[PDB]
Amino acid sequence: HMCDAFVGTWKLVSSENFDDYMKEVGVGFATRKVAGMAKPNMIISVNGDVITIKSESTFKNTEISFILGQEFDEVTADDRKVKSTITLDGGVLVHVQKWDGKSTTIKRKREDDKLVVECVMKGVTSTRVYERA
Ligand SMILES: N#Cc1cccc(Nc2ccccc2C(=O)O)c1
């Protein structure tokens, strides 16, 4: 019953500062424009200790499966090859990506009937609000 409140199919309903967050990450112009137009669905499921998170949109469909606390390799939607570790910290899923001596942290939290995603790169934060689909 690890992660029960996250499981489901979620749809993006608002975004703030996502272009700036992508700039800080190093995403190029054309990817930023196309990616920023997307209204992804995030589909979260759990089977034993394995969590799966799918992101589907007109831009890209990606999928990660992982065990909490156990590093894995991830190819991001913008084609970074990163080393990822996802943990639960006080009810928040905390996803750290490392690549080329850089780091970004993506937090996912349940707040009321929403799933709130905070993406942080250095001083720049983007907030992405999802609702149940
Ligand atoms: N291209 C591209 C790109 C680059 C960085 C992050 C993301 N998207 C996300 C990642 C993680 C969680 C939620 C989102 C989300 O879209 O809400 C897309």
PDB file of N, CA and C and ligand atoms in Angstrom, residues 12 18 21-22 25 27 31-32 35-36 40 42 55 59 74 76-80 95 97 106 108 117 119 128 130, ligand 1:
ATOM      1  N   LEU A  12      -2.755  16.419 -17.078  1.00  0.00           N
ATOM      2  CA  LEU A  12      -2.187  17.742 -16.774  1.00  0.00           C
ATOM      3  C   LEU A  12      -3.344  18.777 -16.910  1.00  0.00           C
ATOM      4  N   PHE A  18       7.308  26.186 -16.740  1.00  0.00           N
ATOM      5  CA  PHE A  18       7.897  24.953 -17.299  1.00  0.00           C
ATOM      6  C   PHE A  18       8.897  25.255 -18.386  1.00  0.00           C
ATOM      7  N   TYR A  21      12.096  26.143 -16.593  1.00  0.00           N
ATOM      8  CA  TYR A  21      12.683  24.951 -15.992  1.00  0.00           C
ATOM      9  C   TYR A  21      13.418  24.159 -17.126  1.00  0.00           C
ATOM     10  N   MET A  22      12.789  23.974 -18.257  1.00  0.00           N
ATOM     11  CA  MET A  22      13.421  23.311 -19.371  1.00  0.00           C
ATOM     12  C   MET A  22      14.670  24.045 -19.848  1.00  0.00           C
ATOM     13  N   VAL A  25      17.478  23.229 -17.496  1.00  0.00           N
ATOM     14  CA  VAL A  25      17.920  21.896 -17.716  1.00  0.00           C
ATOM     15  C   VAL A  25      18.858  21.767 -18.939  1.00  0.00           C
ATOM     16  N   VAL A  27      17.340  22.127 -22.309  1.00  0.00           N
ATOM     17  CA  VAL A  27      16.512  21.724 -23.435  1.00  0.00           C
ATOM     18  C   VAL A  27      16.529  22.794 -24.512  1.00  0.00           C
ATOM     19  N   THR A  31      12.448  21.564 -29.033  1.00  0.00           N
ATOM     20  CA  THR A  31      11.909  20.664 -28.012  1.00  0.00           C
ATOM     21  C   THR A  31      11.130  21.406 -26.970  1.00  0.00           C
ATOM     22  N   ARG A  32      11.640  22.507 -26.476  1.00  0.00           N
ATOM     23  CA  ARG A  32      10.876  23.272 -25.470  1.00  0.00           C
ATOM     24  C   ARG A  32       9.479  23.706 -25.968  1.00  0.00           C
ATOM     25  N   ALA A  35       7.313  20.326 -26.548  1.00  0.00           N
ATOM     26  CA  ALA A  35       7.088  19.721 -25.203  1.00  0.00           C
ATOM     27  C   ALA A  35       6.197  20.591 -24.374  1.00  0.00           C
ATOM     28  N   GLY A  36       6.374  21.912 -24.447  1.00  0.00           N
ATOM     29  CA  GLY A  36       5.564  22.771 -23.636  1.00  0.00           C
ATOM     30  C   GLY A  36       4.096  22.831 -24.042  1.00  0.00           C
ATOM     31  N   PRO A  40       0.222  16.053 -21.024  1.00  0.00           N
ATOM     32  CA  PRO A  40       0.443  14.646 -20.773  1.00  0.00           C
ATOM     33  C   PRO A  40      -0.579  14.015 -19.878  1.00  0.00           C
ATOM     34  N   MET A  42      -0.287  11.072 -16.947  1.00  0.00           N
ATOM     35  CA  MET A  42       0.691  10.383 -16.134  1.00  0.00           C
ATOM     36  C   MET A  42      -0.087   9.193 -15.529  1.00  0.00           C
ATOM     37  N   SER A  55       4.283   8.388 -18.930  1.00  0.00           N
ATOM     38  CA  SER A  55       3.895   9.758 -19.357  1.00  0.00           C
ATOM     39  C   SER A  55       3.585   9.681 -20.804  1.00  0.00           C
ATOM     40  N   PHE A  59       3.641  14.589 -27.807  1.00  0.00           N
ATOM     41  CA  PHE A  59       5.070  14.744 -27.979  1.00  0.00           C
ATOM     42  C   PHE A  59       5.866  13.466 -27.815  1.00  0.00           C
ATOM     43  N   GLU A  74      17.644   6.133 -17.010  1.00  0.00           N
ATOM     44  CA  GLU A  74      16.432   6.685 -17.601  1.00  0.00           C
ATOM     45  C   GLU A  74      16.885   7.521 -18.847  1.00  0.00           C
ATOM     46  N   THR A  76      15.245  10.511 -20.706  1.00  0.00           N
ATOM     47  CA  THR A  76      14.187  11.507 -20.523  1.00  0.00           C
ATOM     48  C   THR A  76      13.535  11.882 -21.847  1.00  0.00           C
ATOM     49  N   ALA A  77      12.390  12.537 -21.732  1.00  0.00           N
ATOM     50  CA  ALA A  77      11.644  12.928 -22.927  1.00  0.00           C
ATOM     51  C   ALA A  77      12.426  13.816 -23.882  1.00  0.00           C
ATOM     52  N   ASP A  78      13.298  14.642 -23.309  1.00  0.00           N
ATOM     53  CA  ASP A  78      14.234  15.458 -24.068  1.00  0.00           C
ATOM     54  C   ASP A  78      15.593  14.816 -24.414  1.00  0.00           C
ATOM     55  N   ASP A  79      15.678  13.487 -24.249  1.00  0.00           N
ATOM     56  CA  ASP A  79      16.801  12.654 -24.637  1.00  0.00           C
ATOM     57  C   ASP A  79      18.040  12.807 -23.825  1.00  0.00           C
ATOM     58  N   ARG A  80      17.916  13.176 -22.570  1.00  0.00           N
ATOM     59  CA  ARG A  80      19.041  13.082 -21.675  1.00  0.00           C
ATOM     60  C   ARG A  80      19.158  11.651 -21.214  1.00  0.00           C
ATOM     61  N   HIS A  95      12.308  12.311  -6.881  1.00  0.00           N
ATOM     62  CA  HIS A  95      12.997  11.700  -8.087  1.00  0.00           C
ATOM     63  C   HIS A  95      14.191  12.607  -8.403  1.00  0.00           C
ATOM     64  N   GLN A  97      17.570  13.103 -10.718  1.00  0.00           N
ATOM     65  CA  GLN A  97      18.250  12.763 -11.987  1.00  0.00           C
ATOM     66  C   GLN A  97      19.597  13.386 -12.048  1.00  0.00           C
ATOM     67  N   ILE A 106      12.573  16.137  -9.100  1.00  0.00           N
ATOM     68  CA  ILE A 106      11.140  16.161  -9.406  1.00  0.00           C
ATOM     69  C   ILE A 106      10.421  15.579  -8.225  1.00  0.00           C
ATOM     70  N   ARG A 108       6.648  14.613  -6.491  1.00  0.00           N
ATOM     71  CA  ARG A 108       5.234  14.330  -6.754  1.00  0.00           C
ATOM     72  C   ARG A 108       4.538  14.175  -5.407  1.00  0.00           C
ATOM     73  N   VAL A 117       3.205  18.230  -9.199  1.00  0.00           N
ATOM     74  CA  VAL A 117       4.564  17.862  -9.554  1.00  0.00           C
ATOM     75  C   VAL A 117       5.411  19.185  -9.509  1.00  0.00           C
ATOM     76  N   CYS A 119       9.160  20.536 -10.326  1.00  0.00           N
ATOM     77  CA  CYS A 119      10.444  20.242 -10.991  1.00  0.00           C
ATOM     78  C   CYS A 119      11.388  21.389 -10.652  1.00  0.00           C
ATOM     79  N   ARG A 128       3.536  21.710 -11.895  1.00  0.00           N
ATOM     80  CA  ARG A 128       2.657  21.044 -12.890  1.00  0.00           C
ATOM     81  C   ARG A 128       1.547  20.341 -12.103  1.00  0.00           C
ATOM     82  N   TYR A 130      -1.833  18.024 -11.910  1.00  0.00           N
ATOM     83  CA  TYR A 130      -2.559  16.984 -12.539  1.00  0.00           C
ATOM     84  C   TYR A 130      -3.874  16.707 -11.705  1.00  0.00           C
TER      85      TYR A 130
HETATM   86  N1  LIG B   1      10.842  17.416 -23.068  1.00  0.00           N
HETATM   87  C1  LIG B   1      10.794  17.347 -21.944  1.00  0.00           C
HETATM   88  C2  LIG B   1      10.748  17.268 -20.481  1.00  0.00           C
HETATM   89  C3  LIG B   1      11.888  17.588 -19.727  1.00  0.00           C
HETATM   90  C4  LIG B   1      11.793  17.542 -18.332  1.00  0.00           C
HETATM   91  C5  LIG B   1      10.651  17.159 -17.651  1.00  0.00           C
HETATM   92  C6  LIG B   1       9.552  16.820 -18.423  1.00  0.00           C
HETATM   93  N2  LIG B   1       8.263  16.451 -17.942  1.00  0.00           N
HETATM   94  C7  LIG B   1       7.986  15.924 -16.645  1.00  0.00           C
HETATM   95  C8  LIG B   1       8.968  15.147 -15.969  1.00  0.00           C
HETATM   96  C9  LIG B   1       8.680  14.578 -14.768  1.00  0.00           C
HETATM   97  C10 LIG B   1       7.448  14.765 -14.165  1.00  0.00           C
HETATM   98  C11 LIG B   1       6.442  15.481 -14.811  1.00  0.00           C
HETATM   99  C12 LIG B   1       6.704  16.105 -16.048  1.00  0.00           C
HETATM  100  C13 LIG B   1       5.607  16.775 -16.738  1.00  0.00           C
HETATM  101  O1  LIG B   1       5.582  16.974 -17.992  1.00  0.00           O
HETATM  102  O2  LIG B   1       4.696  17.220 -15.998  1.00  0.00           O
HETATM  103  C14 LIG B   1       9.595  16.907 -19.841  1.00  0.00           C
END
